[PDB]
Amino acid sequence: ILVGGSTRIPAVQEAIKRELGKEPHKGVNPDEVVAIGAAIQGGVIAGEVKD
């Protein structure tokens, strides 16, 4: 994955996947990526009641 808005960098990126498996995951806008996750799991937490 990736996070950390400073992470969008030429050399970090270039220098990672190569020492690693496939292409680093993208497009989720890192500086919020985490907050995004939060909200998702919250949405789910409200979506409990199925009766």
Binding site: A46, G47, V49, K50, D51
Partner: protein, 51 residues
Amino acid sequence: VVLLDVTPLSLGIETMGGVFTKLIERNTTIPTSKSQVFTTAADNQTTVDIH
């Protein structure tokens, strides 16, 4: 013929976390269908599972 003139069991579904209400009873001539409409467990049910 006049066969499969009976229903194996009372069929109903999952209310209020499992409380079971009948629509179909037992003994019922098989070529039939009964219909009923429930509503929301709780405000804003984004989705409903059926059991």
